[PDB]
Amino acid sequence: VVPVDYHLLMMFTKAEHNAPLQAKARVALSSLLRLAKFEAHEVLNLHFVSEEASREVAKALLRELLPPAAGFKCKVIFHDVAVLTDKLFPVVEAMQKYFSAGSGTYYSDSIFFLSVAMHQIMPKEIPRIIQLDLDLKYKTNIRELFEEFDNFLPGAVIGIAREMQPVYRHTFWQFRHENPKTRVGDPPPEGLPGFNSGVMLLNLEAMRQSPLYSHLLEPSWVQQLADKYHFRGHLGDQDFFTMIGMEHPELFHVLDCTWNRQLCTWWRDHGYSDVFQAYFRCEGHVKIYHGNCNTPIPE
Template sequence: QIWAVPGPVTACFYRREQALVIVHDVNELTEKLFPIVEAMQKHFSAGSGTYYSDSIFFLSVAMHRIMPKEITRIIQVDLDLKYKTNIRDLFDEFDNFPEGAVIGIAREMQPVYRHTFWQYRRENPQTKVGEPPPDGLPGFNSGVLLLNLEAMRQSKLYNQLLEPTMVQKLTEKYHFKGHLGDQDFFTMVGMEHPELFHVLDCTWNRQLCTWWRDHGYSDVFDQYFQCEGEVKIYHGNCNTAIPED
């Protein structure tokens, strides 16, 4: 079981049983990733040179392809988090994965995908795509990820979805053009194959960004943003201040 933290220069992997920290060069990881995720970048980034355009922002998508086989589970987290509980407790969520699930991830808490899927939603007015919880499909936020690498390696369906032809097929079906890297890929795949995902409670990734409330979605924003329960991890996404203790 590994805790992975991708950063701008290095990626650190923490093996909790051995209290061992291994630092990996991001350039080397990017070189391994590029052939796998090259086809995705044009669909899930805003263009060359933009923040999410680098291959490293697709690390989670193909982690099972580049990590040693003896590593079977990884938790990957963003850096803009504040932990209110022991991170070890999050590992217990692996035990809650339903059969066939390969990734644990929380829902997106802004109507960003209500916006991104606008054309598909217009053509399919009864769809749950982009709708808020609990009955809708608001998409995912990749700030906290549980990657069952062994399940990812064994899943024929998941690996088929990494193929460029499948990525192209789904982006065309959903008229999808995103800009958030791996999060966009997981969101799009989740619309088609929700069985691949174990949905984490919002308290494990309590996002704080309110950008979309002030940019055209104030009428529905609270339906996405609400989160009941004791927060375990705060996520200060889009440079939002995290509450002090």
């Protein structure tokens, strides 16, 4: 029986003396591991991106949760945030001016763009990986999310859920002003509300093998599109994918809202009461809750 590997990756940095983050990670990992089911030859690989102090914190938490109740094989891998930052920087430098808080190009921001260049960072043996926030609660077997890779149309490289607040309606204001008729920043079903980065299916092989995706990483393409859209942000990879998704929606397999049900309502109380519902609406059986902007998750 040849072993089949499944890969997840989570950012876990600055966790020491950060009780809220540790508590979120505990909720995420315990739910993940409690509900996961994998066949005997299968192995779940949990990648964490951490500096040395958070690595120690993560190990302490994981030993409390491993082995998993279901008894399948699980491997834990740590990646040094400082190593990854240096590998990322050449590729990611040009976009940081547009999508980082705030100005200009700082190493401390580079790691927020890991997903955009994940295909260049992870070993070649890894064809696919799902990057996950740690402020999630899983309501189903994570094995099921991997079948969404099967639904990628030719040319799609990344699976991602839409953003459930009007943050991009706000961000694309100028472009929306100059293009009254645009779908850019509008709510579903026919608008493009942008993406949320909490759950991302990164098909590393498809990303590597796409001429289009590779071009979009080039500094002049980043600049051209940022200029076209009058677009600035501070949410890192989320903003980049959101922007290239306006120009090239074919690159993205849009996940159903139930795979990343975002709970943050910050934008409702900051000017978008009228339209907020059209963005936030999600119905169906929820598979993953996402407590973004420090929003408590219900039970």
